């Protein structure tokens, strides 16, 4: 019959998603591996 009938909803689907994170993404890990010589196998180092 005549009238205004509600059928369904419609949402605006989201487009491409993004993620944002801060600056200062660093410590010098090279100073551990770019050491010129390594020590004796009885002097293992924990460069914390």
């Amino acid at each position: 019959e005549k009238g205004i009938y509600q059928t369904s909803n419609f949402r605006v689907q989201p487009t491409e998603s993004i993620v944002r994170f801060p600056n200062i993404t660093n410590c010098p890990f090279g100073e551990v591996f770019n050491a010129t010589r390594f020590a004796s196998v009885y002097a293992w180092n924990r460069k914390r």
Partner: nanobody
Framework: VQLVESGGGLVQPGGSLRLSCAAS????????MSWVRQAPGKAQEWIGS???????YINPSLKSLVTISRDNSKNTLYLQLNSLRAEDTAMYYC????????????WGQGTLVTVS
């Protein structure tokens, strides 16, 4: 100045020589103080080592050529050179912590040595 070196000079082939290094305090020698040489052309190598456990074990290749002793009155450290040939040009630095890689060694100025 807290560490110095004394002795050394021209080496007549077949002659004897005296060399030394010093430190500042008794805690500075604690726990390890090991001799070391360097050399232009020839690879750097450690001369002698005195471990803090009382047992001294020099390198199997360098344990039958160098005599090592310590004197804390001057903090001096006797070192002697014997029978250098034309193939052993070495320049001597007194650098600690060589059994810790290149992350614990202390670099200063040292002295320059030429052996003809």
């Amino acid at each position: 100045v807290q560490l110095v070196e004394s002795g050394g000079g021209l080496v007549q082939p077949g002659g004897s020589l005296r060399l030394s290094c010093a430190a500042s305090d008794s805690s500075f020698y604690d726990y390890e103080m090991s001799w070391v040489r360097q050399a232009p052309g020839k690879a750097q190598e450690w001369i002698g080592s005195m471990y803090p456990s009382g047992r001294t074990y020099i390198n199997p290749s360098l344990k039958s050529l160098v005599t090592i002793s310590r004197d804390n009155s001057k903090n001096t450290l006797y070192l002697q050179l014997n029978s250098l040939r034309a193939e052993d040009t070495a320049m001597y630095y007194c650098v600690s912590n060589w059994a810790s890689g290149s992350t614990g060694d202390y670099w200063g100025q040292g002295t320059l040595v030429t052996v003809s």
